[PDB]
């Protein structure tokens, strides 16, 4: 597959691992400490058993090993409790840091880039694609560091007692990976033969479920169940051939964890009888040396078995890594933040001589254009669809980086502080969203601490109080796309309330009456025409019948204004 990418992708993950490297070492250290307690377990049980079975020592006499075996059990359950808490803490700080880096890179990239992709798939990247990176750091890595350490302790702990039992466990150490690779050349062939189909045929139920409206109009409602049954009766028998060979890769681990316990039982069992006199260091084979190997025989393969379960969490954290790595490798262009100030709250005199507007992706938006209007002047933009007139409104707000020269009251916009520049700005898009939880908290978005009397003045000015009785809870009605939604006629009349609540210097109306009902249109226009003459404004409305009082009119067709002048 993508061998060139996977090796590189599996390397980016380890660079993210350094955020919680302190706990990924404690979790690795506790893997060794939990390894020691397993041999400590297996020795006390073996020594206790040999004394009882062979020396017939009463249980009360050998109470010291009993109170030590219990202590290891408590001390071994403690590190197990402690490992999957340090493991979680190791995997949480990765998610917390990446989610902060993703949100940070998604906020200073501006709202110009967020429009490029639906907000549902942005929330799919911040919710699921970063939570999928948990079990790799929290469970898989603290386990892959247990599959290379713990099984080695057993071999190191039986080798002093019996080199024959040490080789039986170690004999399967190279044999297991070889056989998985020998069956992996057939499993990865069928998984490639069915790769086209299963990917094409797994999203079948969702597509039928997603297009039920189109599926019931034409009467195919009861004829697609015969196509969901037939696309799921094939999904089974096609993935039951990939599984049929993918479960041999685990059977050849259950084959060696059974051959290695049978051999340890048969070899040691025959060694006591005097058959196989080749394993011990010419000191006789004690019974306790057999139980130590027998108890540790399953513990050798326990780590290699559990790693098989968490191995799916490696591709899951890689399949969700190409979405996040390429997110933070985009060359997108920031708006070139700077520091400056505007002392006067009075209307600003914007101007330009040679200006270009470029997308974060790097594509240009508006060609060479230049315009000047002094303070108090109220311009208006008209043009064909796709001319780029909203870009100019979208770049006067600081959302789009410009490589030309735009000047705010004699001060370059490039070096102007965006955090303080926007305090002298008001913005009304054609399709405005309502991010606040409730309508009352939505009008008071510029100044939340506004007095209730000031709030009432804005509502009457914006003609939103007229339909207030229609909503159930009055002004505190929750607003959104799932609870008591406002019509576009009403939702536009509360965005107007936002802009006029806090006095500003430059007002950027972006087609306030584009998608708006006839009654609300005359209410908004009456409000926004009386609220545009007291400062510099920039309207980009497309209907142009009422432009008599708009002093200057700029028309642009292909990213450049062609002629500017009054309606007359």
């Amino acid at each position: 597959m993508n061998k060139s990418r996977q090796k590189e992708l599996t390397r980016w993950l380890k660079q993210q691992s350094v955020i919680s490297q302190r706990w990924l070492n404690i979790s690795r250290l506790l893997g060794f400490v939990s390894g020691i307690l397993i041999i400590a377990q297996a020795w006390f049980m073996a020594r206790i058993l040999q004394h009882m079975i062979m020396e017939n020592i009463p249980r009360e006499a050998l109470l010291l090993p009993f109170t030590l075996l219990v202590l290891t059990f408590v001390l071994r359950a403690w590190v197990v409790w402690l490992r999957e808490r340090v493991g979680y803490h190791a995997g949480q700080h990765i998610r917390f840091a990446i989610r902060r880096q993703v949100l940070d890179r998604l906020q200073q990239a501006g709202p110009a880039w967020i429009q490029g992709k639906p907000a549902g798939s942005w929330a799919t990247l911040v919710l699921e694609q970063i939570d999928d990176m948990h079990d790799y750091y929290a469970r898989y890595l603290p386990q892959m560091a247990l599959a290379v350490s713990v099984p080695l302790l057993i071999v190191v702990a039986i080798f002093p007692s019996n080199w024959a039992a040490a080789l039986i466990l170690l004999g399967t150490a190279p044999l297991i990976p070889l056989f998985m690779a020998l069956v992996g050349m057939g499993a990865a062939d069928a998984n490639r033969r069915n790769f086209l189909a299963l990917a094409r045929l797994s999203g079948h139920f969702l597509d039928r479920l997603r297009g039920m409206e189109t599926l019931r109009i034409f009467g195919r409602g009861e004829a697609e169940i015969e196509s969901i049954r037939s696309a799921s009766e094939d999904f089974r028998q096609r993935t039951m051939e990939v599984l049929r060979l993918a479960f041999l890769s685990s059977g050849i681990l259950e084959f060696f964890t059974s051959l290695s316990i049978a051999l340890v039982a048969v070899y040691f069992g025959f060694s006591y009888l005097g058959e196989l006199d080749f394993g011990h260091y010419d000191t006789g084979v004690t019974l306790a040396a057999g139980f130590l190997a027998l108890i540790l025989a399953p513990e050798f393969f326990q780590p290699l078995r559990d790693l098989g379960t968490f191995y799916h969490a490696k591709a899951q954290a890689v399949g969700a890594a190409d979405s996040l790595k390429t997110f933070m490798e985009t060359p997108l262009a920031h708006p070139q933040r700077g520091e400056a100030e505007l002392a006067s709250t009075d209307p600003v005199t914007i101007e330009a001589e040679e200006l270009f507007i470029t997308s974060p992706e790097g594509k240009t938006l508006a060609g060479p254009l230049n315009f000047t209007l002094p303070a108090g002047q109220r311009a208006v933009l008209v043009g064909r669809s796709g001319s780029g007139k909203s870009s100019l409104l979208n770049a006067l707000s600081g959302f789009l980086s410009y490589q030309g020269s735009l000047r705010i009251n004699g001060i370059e916009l490039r070096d102007l502080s965006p955090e303080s520049w926007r305090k002298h700005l008001s913005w009304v898009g054609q399709n405005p969203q309502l991010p606040a939880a409730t309508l009352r908290d939505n009008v008071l978005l510029a100044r939340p601490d506004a007095s209730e009397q000031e709030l009432q003045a804005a509502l009457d000015n914006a003609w939103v109080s007229e339909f207030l009785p229609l909503l159930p809870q009055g002004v505190d009605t929750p607003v959104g796309d799932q609870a008591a939604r406002l019509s576009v006629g009403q939702a536009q009349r509360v965005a107007v309330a936002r802009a006029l609540l806090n006095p500003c210097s430059l007002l950027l109306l972006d087609e306030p009456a584009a998608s708006l009902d006839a009654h609300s249109e005359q209410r908004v226009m009456e409000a926004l025409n009386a609220a545009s003459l007291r400062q510099t404004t920039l309207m980009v409305t497309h209907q142009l019948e009422d432009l008599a009082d708009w002093d200057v009119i700029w028309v642009m067709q292909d990213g450049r204004i062609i002629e500017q002048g009054r309606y007359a």
């Binding site: 907000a119 969702l206 799921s232 006839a518």
Partner: protein
């Protein structure tokens, strides 16, 4: 646990394949317990006998047991995973069908309130979750309940006290630990899903409102609110990970408790024999190996919590009463139809203002009418009553001077064919993407329609066999709309009411109305609805309407 009853009757259908995986699960765990308890006994039986008793100790049979148990464990594990997944995939198709069959009568109405993008992605997510009920909650639990009984009865032939205290420890934790942890993580699991939807709702409203959260300076305040929810959310996740660590640390103590007790009490003796030579190792090694049977029980309270929560969502979604009912009269297919509307009103569920007020228009048969709504104002809502997705309230819909509610589902779909506002590619062959309109149609006739509507470009390279949808090539927005009319031609209906055909495309919008009058102009009625005032003069009775009411109709 009463929410699982509807989704457990789909498992009883395959009870004779589901139970083979459980029986295979029992054997591969008995073969793994038996392999190690026999090894433990054989390891101590020979040591006590020593070299002196070599000729008086039958080792032929124990050596056959370790050989028999080794093959049984490795073969049983392989055949378990096949049969378990084979039955899991076979009940999956009975869950996809059951969900689809129930969700279909209420697809336009019962799914209106939810965000269709997240709702349907959720439904598929919690159909897979319900599919893993057997493979993680039944097979680990039912397969481990009888494994304990076999060893308890098996060890009961040596000593009743030792067999039962080991079985009593195992059976108690099987019946008591899963409930005491499902009862402890229930509050957190409910609170964890609330914050996941609260973080997703605040984040979506932060990215969508990013344009105006920065102009008004609230982009940093609503980020602190957003991150505070994440802090709460990541602490609910920690609590459910403080139970996974506690559940794993307890059965390593219970599994300990059942090892010392076998070491301790069996010293006194097994049966009447006060000096058990090798039978001490037969009980401690059985107890040592028999807690892998209850190992999958760990975490089976987390997997039971998601499954039961998933069963609630589907039940709360597929048990809604259909908003509209279709009486079955077996009426014949009407021809040359003509409807009419008289004061049709309709408000959506959980709404306080009507989306349709005082709608009244009369259409004759074979008449082309364009309804022009500038935005919203229920132009696409009006078309839903005609296709009968919702039932109008204080309204009357009459088709051929007869009520529309008298039509049965088969006949209503026949008389009315609509091109929706958003067209759907069904991820099948372009052949199978047009058979939706006509279930049975000759290919040669079908292939003529595509070249008739200007879509002959798709037939270049095995076009009728070319995959569409996500797998294949996606038709462009302008080109995709050209396919909806094709599906409205194969399924010829006396009433073919369109819905924004010209929206979103300009290169070929001029030619779009051409076939709207090239073959829809004969004995057909079209209720075309658009807000694009372009080449609409060829349509009589043009009607403009705003705020959900018809004004100054032509």
């Amino acid at each position: 646990m009463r929410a699982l009853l509807p989704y457990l009757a789909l498992y009883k259908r395959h009870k004779w394949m589901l139970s083979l995986g459980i029986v295979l699960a029992i054997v591969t765990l008995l073969a793994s317990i038996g392999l190690l308890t026999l090894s433990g006994w054989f390891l101590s039986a020979s040591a006590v006998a020593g070299v002196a008793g070599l000729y008086s100790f039958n080792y032929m049979l124990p050596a056959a047991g370790v050989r028999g148990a080794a093959i049984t464990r490795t073969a049983g594990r392989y055949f378990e995973r096949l049969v378990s997944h084979d039955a899991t995939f076979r009940v999956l198709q009975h869950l996809r069908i059951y969900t689809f069959s129930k969700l279909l009568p209420l697809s336009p109405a019962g799914l209106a309130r939810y965000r269709q993008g997240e709702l349907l992605n959720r439904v598929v997510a919690d159909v897979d979750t319900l599919d893993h009920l057997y493979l993680r909650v039944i097979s680990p639990l039912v397969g481990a309940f009888v494994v304990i009984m076999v060893v308890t009865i098996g060890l009961s032939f040596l000593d009743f006290t030792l067999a039962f205290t080991l079985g009593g420890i195992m059976l108690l934790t099987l019946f008591l630990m899963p409930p005491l942890f499902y009862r402890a993580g229930k509050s957190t699991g409910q609170n964890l899903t609330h914050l996941r939807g609260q973080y997703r709702q605040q984040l979506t409203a932060w990215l969508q409102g990013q344009a105006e959260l920065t102009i008004f300076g609230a982009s940093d305040r609503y980020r602190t609110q957003l991150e505070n929810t994440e802090i709460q959310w990541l602490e609910a996740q920690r609590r459910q990970s403080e139970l996974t660590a506690l559940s794993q640390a307890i059965m390593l103590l219970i599994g300990a408790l059942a090892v010392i007790l076998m070491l301790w009490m069996a010293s006194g003796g097994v049966g009447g024999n006060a000096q058990p030579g090798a039978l001490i190792a037969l009980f401690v090694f059985c107890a040592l190996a028999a807690f892998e049977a209850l190992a999958p029980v760990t975490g089976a309270f987390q997997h039971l919590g998601q499954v039961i929560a998933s069963a609630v969502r589907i039940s709360d979604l597929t048990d809604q009463k259909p908003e509209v009912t279709f009486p079955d009269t077996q009426t014949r297919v009407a021809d040359r139809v003509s409807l009419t509307l008289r004061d049709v009103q309709f408000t959506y569920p959980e709404q306080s203002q009507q989306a349709l007020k005082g709608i009244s228009l009369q259409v004759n048969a074979g008449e082309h009418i364009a309804i022009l709504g500038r935005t919203g104002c229920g132009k696409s809502t009006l078309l839903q009553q005609l296709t009968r997705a919702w039932d109008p309230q204080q309204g009357e819909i009459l088709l051929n001077d007869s009520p529309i509610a008298s039509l049965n589902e088969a006949a209503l779909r026949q008389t009315i064919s609509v091109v929706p506002q958003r067209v759907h590619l069904f991820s099948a062959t372009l052949r199978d993407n047009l058979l939706l309109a006509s279930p049975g149609s000759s290919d040669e006739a079908l292939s003529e329609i595509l070249r008739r509507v200007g879509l002959e470009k798709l037939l270049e390279d095995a076009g009728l066999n070319s995959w569409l949808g996500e797998g294949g090539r996606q038709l462009s927005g302008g080109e995709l709309r050209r396919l909806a009319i094709a599906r409205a031609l194969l399924h010829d209906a006396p009433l073919v009411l369109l819905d924004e055909p010209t929206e979103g495309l300009d290169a070929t919008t001029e030619s779009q109305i051409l076939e709207l009058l090239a073959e829809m102009m004969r004995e057909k009625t079209v209720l075309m609805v658009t807000h694009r005032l372009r080449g609409l003069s060829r349509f009589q009775q043009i009607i403009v309407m705003d705020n959900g009411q018809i004004i100054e109709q032509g």
